[PDB]
Design a protein around this nucleic acid. Structure first.
Ligand SMILES: [Mg+2]
Ligand SMILES: [Mg+2]
Ligand SMILES: [Mg+2]
Ligand SMILES: [Mg+2]
Ligand SMILES: [Mg+2]
Ligand SMILES: [Mg+2]
Ligand SMILES: [Mg+2]
Ligand SMILES: [Mg+2]
Ligand SMILES: [Mg+2]
Ligand SMILES: [Mg+2]
Ligand SMILES: [Mg+2]
Ligand SMILES: [Mg+2]
Ligand SMILES: [Mg+2]
Ligand SMILES: [Mg+2]
Ligand SMILES: [Mg+2]
Ligand SMILES: [Mg+2]
Lengths: 81, 209, 124, 25, 210, 72, 129, 86, 99
RNA sequence: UUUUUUUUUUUUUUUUU
RNA sequence: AGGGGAUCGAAGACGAUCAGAUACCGUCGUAGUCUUAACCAUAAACUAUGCCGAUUAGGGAUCGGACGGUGUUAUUUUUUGACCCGUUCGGCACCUUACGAUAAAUCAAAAUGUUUGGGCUCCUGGGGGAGUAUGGUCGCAAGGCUGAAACUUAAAGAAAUUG
């Protein structure tokens, strides 16, 4: 190309490249709130949780860890923080 | 844009209509790294949609280079496949260039005793992949090359690229139509920029014998 | 085998490329033609040239041959080239049937006035 | 001569040399 | 007499100096052009090398001649031609040598008075395995090259230079081509004095319409 | 080239490696071992004197046919 | 294992320069690299260089103007005496009026010509011309 | 230049408009693209034009097209083709 | 001189491949190096297909096809004209012959 | 896709407008 | 040193071929081939290409993981599997090209090297004699590792070219 402004790449490129290979290694993970069915408690869950998260006092599993990404239990709504 | 580009050269709806009708926006399924700037979007089926705005804008620049020579006999146009052959002879007819259709004899530019010695000043080719012999000979005698490059078309020595479909008969004629009209306006044989031209489009479209 | 040499073929083509109206399909008349126009001084060679000339003349009556103009073709290909239909195939006379990405280019380029008929794009 | 069996010939000759030395020792 | 566009312009007086041609990458195809612009040239023959092709009825013997052309003003050319006869090979080599004449940049060693005496930088050319390296030398140091390379440097006008060589220097054809590459590349190594904007001008070929 | 050490404190390795590899040089090995003083027919001298024991003829190597005249 | 970040910067610079690129990305960031770049910039052999800050070793984007023949490092950093500059310059540079040999002295990162003025010496670390 | 301020070089080579490398005398394949300016009526002006010189190296690599686009906008000959962010 | 980029086989990254026996030599050759032909032809020759259909009783019988996999060494395939010596440039063409 | 071993020594080319 | 011993098959015995045939071919056939315990430590043990690290032309396949989208298919209190498109990390490789390299064949490394310095280890110095002799050390042995010299010779050798 011989002429690229490497300081300010496209935001589409940022979502395309690897999380380390960008100009500044911004993590691709996030924190998210899980609404469990039958109760009204909000629990913060990591997007890539490695443990079976159970709500505080509801005794209900909220997500199962698999393949480097938590799979939320069916019947629960979520909202990224 | 403000400098050395008055607002008259901007695209018109008629030019956009003819280019779209010719399907000059439908590019090859393979994308080249050097044809990336001319890419607009890629459809769901994998067919690359080009940016017609750049195509017209590049055509104006190509005409500017042609008009700068100020000698029609020093401009050479080449097309191997018969689809571009009909347009090339007609382009030479109205402009004043020297045209070669079909097979390009090797040694035309380098060997000076062959029957087709040219000594041109500008090589204009269609589909610069089957005309690689013409391009490579231009690498020996310092001739800038203007090519109707496609998305997958090699750009080995293409100095000025015109991103357009170069496989359909309709697309080739329309692009060769754009350049023919622009060159004549620049040189001055046409008095008005807004006046329609008497020759029409199907005169350049390839026809069977 | 009886394969004619290049000195016969090349000379005969020049005869056809120049003297087509004078020539005809009769060998005996073509025999006399080669007498007046060429300088052969060899009956065998002249008979071969007239014989090969007659072969192509009969070929001309079918549409062949490439590369032996025959200026009557040259004037003919002129009128073929000049021919052009009056109605342009690029005319919209449903006017312009393109897809979602093509019309998006029109909005980007500032030409959102063409009678564009947007068609769906799906993969089978 | 093949190097495989030039090696074998020398290796056989080395074994005979060691027997001649054991005889003297 | 002229057959190419340059040939017509040269005899028509449209080109004033040879380096005017050299500014644009215009190939020279007619050797009458070089004789016109560069008279008083001196041709020297290095060696006649017999090369043989094996045939079913003996060896086909051809003679190869290596000729360097140059004037002490800073132009050299190298031509190699193989032919059946020595006399024809020599003549054809001279024509090829005149065609491939290149300008030679001359620099200096520290001073700036009577400057054109040595190379401007250190340049090396590599043809095949032979590598010949040319080094600028202080004034008063004569040529320190081998007789084959020394004669070529004399025709270039270089007076002071340090030379070294690796590879199979016994290949006289390879060394001269290696030396020629170094002399070619000494005029295009970017230097501070050339680190200046230049006003681009149209080539004479594209401005004259004769 | 070679993967020679390039540290600033690797002179010992560089000298030791050169000392080992210099033995493969034929002329240094001849001088360092002192083979002229050990195995040469002369004691390393340019000339030597002796008593002629007999006259012998030596056939010349190909391509050459002659009897070179020599003495033991 | 990274051993000479200075070599990585100059190798990346030279690779982009030979390829004709007008800019190059340099990782990581070091005090020596920035000072070595500034020596380039004073003589104009490069253009703008911009350092990107991060919570780690930084990055540098150098804009190249194309007037740069060759830049290289010296390993190891030999201890150079004042009488040894001329031998180092002769054996390593082109003609002795274009290039600049880079030393590290008690006065900092600075040129071989500047050493002759200040009458100081030190360790050779790089060069350019 | 010498101490007297006189040029003794036989001639001064040109530099590529894209990479800045000196174009050698025998560097065939190095083109010189010439673009003529226009007036407000779109008529090309004779004898007055933009001249670009490209080395054979940049042409051979296949970057001659993109470099020309960058150069044209830097001198204003194009409206919107060359995108730095791309 | 290295004659072929892939040497003579396909085991880059495989270390060691168990050998097999040539069809008409019994030569012990590696499976990937061997030259393998899968042949599918009618169990009765085309000349005698009609007579078999005549004896069909039971006249809708389809003659089965023999399913052979022939493995050859280099010497046998070349001598058997299964493969032929190709030119220096033509050796690299890894495409089956067209029909 | 039956087999077919051997060939005594040396000797086999040069310059320019 | 035990167990096992179907097949094949060094050595050996025959039958052919041949001038001879201690070989190729055919019939037998011992050790071995298989296994437990203990040795041996060498292979064209090859990608004939040491390990770590950075950069440098494009492209499509494929394997493992992850991510985003889309529509069929099986299940399903709508999740998962198969197929499709794309992005990315890590692999086995491959295709075209030479801004480069090499003597060349060829090489995305054998590039970034006479414009010669990122770190480390090992090996080589014309061909033989010779991986031999001797000394040491390991092994039950076969042998392995280390490893010369006298003497002899103008070439040996690598890649391509035309016959
Ligand atoms: Mg040597
Ligand atoms: Mg150190
Ligand atoms: Mg001899
Ligand atoms: Mg193995
Ligand atoms: Mg024989
Ligand atoms: Mg005998
Ligand atoms: Mg014998
Ligand atoms: Mg070993
Ligand atoms: Mg090995
Ligand atoms: Mg690496
Ligand atoms: Mg992959
Ligand atoms: Mg995958
Ligand atoms: Mg793998
Ligand atoms: Mg030696
Ligand atoms: Mg040796
Ligand atoms: Mg050989």
């Amino acid at each position: 190309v011989l002429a690229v402004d490497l300081l300010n790449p496209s935001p589409a490129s940022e979502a395309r490249k690897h999380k380390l290979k960008t100009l500044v290694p911004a993590p691709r993970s996030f924190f998210m709130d899980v609404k469990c069915p039958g109760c009204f408690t909000i629990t913060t869950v990591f997007s890539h949780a490695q443990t079976v998260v159970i709500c505080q006092g509801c005794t209900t599993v909220l997500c199962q860890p698999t393949g480097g990404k938590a799979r939320l239990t069916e019947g629960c709504s979520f909202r990224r923080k | 844009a403000p400098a050395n580009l008055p607002s008259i050269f901007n695209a018109t709806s008629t030019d956009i209509e003819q280019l779209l009708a010719a399907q000059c926006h439908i590019g090859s399924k393979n994308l080249g790294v050097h044809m990336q700037p001319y890419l607009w979007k890629t459809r769901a089926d994998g067919v690359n949609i080009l940016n017609v705005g750049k195509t017209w804008e590049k055509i104006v620049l190509a005409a500017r280079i042609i008009a700068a020579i100020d000698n029609p006999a020093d401009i050479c146009v080449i097309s191997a496949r018969p689809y571009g052959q009909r347009a090339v002879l007609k382009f030479a007819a109205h402009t004043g260039a020297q045209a070669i259709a079909g097979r390009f004899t090797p040694g035309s530019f380098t060997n000076y005793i062959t029957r087709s010695f040219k000594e041109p000043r500008l090589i204009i080719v269609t589909d610069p992949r089957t005309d690689a012999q013409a391009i490579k000979e231009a690498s020996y005698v310092n001739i800038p090359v203007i090519a109707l490059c496609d998305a997958d078309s090699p750009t080995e020595y293409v100095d000025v690229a015109i991103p357009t479909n170069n496989k359909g008969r309709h697309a080739i004629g329309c692009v060769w139509w754009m350049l023919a009209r622009e060159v004549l306006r620049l040189r001055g044989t046409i008095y008005n920029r807004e006046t329609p031209w008497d020759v029409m489009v199907d005169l350049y479209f390839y026809r069977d014998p | 085998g009886r394969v004619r040499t290049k000195t016969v073929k090349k000379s005969a083509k020049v005869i056809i490329e120049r003297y087509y109206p004078k020539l005809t399909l009769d060998f005996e008349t073509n025999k006399r033609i080669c007498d007046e126009i060429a300088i052969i001084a060899s009956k065998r060679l002249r008979n071969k040239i007239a014989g090969y000339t007659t072969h192509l003349m009969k070929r001309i009556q079918r549409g062949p041959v490439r590369g032996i103009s025959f200026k009557l073709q040259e004037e003919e290909r002129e009128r073929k080239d000049q021919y052009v239909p009056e109605v342009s195939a690029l005319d919209f006379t449903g006017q312009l049937d393109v897809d979602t990405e093509t019309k998006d280019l029109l909005k980007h380029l500032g030409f959102d006035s063409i009678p564009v008929n947007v068609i769906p794009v799906t993969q089978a | 001569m093949r190097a495989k069996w030039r090696k074998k010939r020398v290796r056989r000759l080395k074994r005979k040399r060691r027997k001649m030395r054991a005889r003297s020792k | 007499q002229p057959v190419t566009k340059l040939g017509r312009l040269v005899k028509a007086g449209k080109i004033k100096s040879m380096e005017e041609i050299y500014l644009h990458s215009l190939p020279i195809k007619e050797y009458q052009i070089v004789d016109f612009f560069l008279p008083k040239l001196k041709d020297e023959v290095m060696k006649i090398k017999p090369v043989q092709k094996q045939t079913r009825a003996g060896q086909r013997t051809r003679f190869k001649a290596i000729v360097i052309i140059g004037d002490s003003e800073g132009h050299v050319g190298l031509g190699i031609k193989t032919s059946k006869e020595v006399a024809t090979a020599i003549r054809a080599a001279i024509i090829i040598a005149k065609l491939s004449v290149i300008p030679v940049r001359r620099g200096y060693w520290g001073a700036n008075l009577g400057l054109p005496h040595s190379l401007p930088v250190k340049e090396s050319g590599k043809c095949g395995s032979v590598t010949v390296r040319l080094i600028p030398a202080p004034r008063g140091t004569s040529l320190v090259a081998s007789p084959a390379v020394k004669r070529l440097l004399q025709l270039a006008g270089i007076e002071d230079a340090y030379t070294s060589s690796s590879g199979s220097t016994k290949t006289l054809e390879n060394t001269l081509k290696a030396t020629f590459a170094a002399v070619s590349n000494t005029y295009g190594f970017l230097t501070p004095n050339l680190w200046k904007e230049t006003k681009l001008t149209r080539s004479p070929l594209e401005e004259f319409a004769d | 080239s070679g993967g020679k050490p390039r540290g600033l404190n690797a002179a010992r390795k560089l000298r030791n490696n050169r000392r080992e590899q210099r033995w493969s040089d034929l002329h240094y090995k001849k001088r360092a071992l002192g083979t002229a003083f050990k195995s040469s027919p002369f004691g390393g001298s340019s000339h030597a004197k002796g008593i002629v024991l007999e006259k012998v003829g030596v056939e010349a190597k190909q391509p050459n046919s002659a009897i070179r005249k020599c003495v033991r | 294992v990274r051993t000479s970040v200075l070599h990585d910067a100059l190798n990346s610079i030279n690779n982009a320069e030979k390829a004709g690129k007008r800019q190059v990305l340099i990782r990581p960031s070091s005090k020596v690299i920035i000072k070595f770049l500034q020596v380039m910039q004073k003589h104009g052999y490069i253009g703008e260089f911009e350092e990107v800050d991060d919570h780690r070793s930084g990055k540098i984007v150098v804009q190249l103007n194309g007037r740069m023949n060759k830049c290289g490092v010296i390993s190891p950093r030999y201890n150079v005496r004042l009488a040894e500059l001329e031998k180092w310059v002769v054996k390593l540079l082109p003609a002795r009026q274009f290039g600049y040999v880079i030393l590290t002295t008690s006065a900092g990162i600075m040129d071989h010509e500047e050493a002759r003025r200040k009458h100081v010496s030190g360790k050779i670390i790089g060069f350019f011309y | 230049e010498n101490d007297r301020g006189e040029i003794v070089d036989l001639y001064v080579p040109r530099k590529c408009s894209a990479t800045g490398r000196i174009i050698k005398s025998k560097d065939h394949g190095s083109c010189q693209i010439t673009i003529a300016k226009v007036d407000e009526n779109g008529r090309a002006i004779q004898g007055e034009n933009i001249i670009y010189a490209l080395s054979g190296f940049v042409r051979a690599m296949g970057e001659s097209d993109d470099s020309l686009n960058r150069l044209a906008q830097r001198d204003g000959l194009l409206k919107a083709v060359w995108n730095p962010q791309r | 001189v290295k004659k072929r980029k892939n040497n003579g086989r396909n085991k880059k990254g495989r270390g060691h491949v168990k050998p097999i026996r040539c069809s008409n030599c019994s030569r012990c050759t590696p499976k990937d190096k061997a030259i393998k032909r899968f042949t599918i032809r009618n169990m009765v020759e085309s000349a005698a297909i009609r007579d078999i259909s005549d004896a069909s009783v039971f006249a809708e019988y389809t003659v089965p096809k023999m399913y052979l996999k022939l493995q050859y060494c280099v010497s046998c395939a070349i001598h058997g004209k299964i493969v032929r010596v190709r030119s220096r440039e033509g050796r690299r063409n890894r495409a089956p012959p067209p029909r």
